[PDB]
């Protein structure tokens, strides 16, 4: 299942997105989870340590800890430093864009949706249905600049 | 074919990338694409206009001037103006890693391969081959943490 609907704001979310150093297909991922391309949902989304999630692409402390400037040679047990990213959206997009160019997309996909246990294989199922979930979804940001301003989210049921 | 070589001074090469901005993952692309990670192939790759190469990725200008930002709007024309990515390693790695944030990795994998016309089919078996090899290239430098600063190249005949 997937299709639109209109979120009132996310045009300038999505613009202060871009003008922060995201990319168009950093819009894709963070679009694909949460509605309102925020921080707000409940703290590390009601995981702790290692599996802890942050930031607007609901990065978990596994991937943060290991392949981010930021984050890089951090413990398990020091988990709640990765809540900085909700508030700090410049240091939110790069570090997944340093994950990312760490670990290569593939790789990045699987640690980002599985953890340490994803890294040993990115190619099962379930990460590729959430990989080509952010797929479409960047195909359709991609196919008119509007919707890089405009309120329109494109959601994916993953 | 796969295999590896020695290439002396390629580990000073190496550093140099990734202390310009560039990941594990734009190390094994540029791999893939020069013996020595340099610039002093032919120029433009012998190739002009859209078509052109340049940099130690061997970014074609369609590319370069659809999805960087130090190239954006500009037309098929101006195709030199990405000669200074021939000296630039802080501009060639920033214009690629924008490009495959503008397009994302599939797509940004098939226009480098083959221009605008890949866009239109980003998963023939030439695109998927050298995404493959990088993929490879990329875990061979990602096994042993010497690898990114030694003088090994990993090879790939496709």
Redesign the interface.
Known sequence: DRGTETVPGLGQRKQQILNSG?????L?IAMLETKNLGTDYVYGDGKTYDSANFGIFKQNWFMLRTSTSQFKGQTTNQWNNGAVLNSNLQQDIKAR??S???????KWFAGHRNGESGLSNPYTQDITNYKDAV?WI?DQL?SDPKYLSDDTRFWVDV
Do not use: I, R, S, T
């Not at 995201?22 to 950093?26: A, L, N, P």
């Not at 990312?100 to 593939?106: A, C, E, F, R, V």
């Open positions: 995201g990319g168009v297909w950093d894709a864009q340093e990312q160019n760490y670990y290569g997309p593939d797929n960047h991609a």
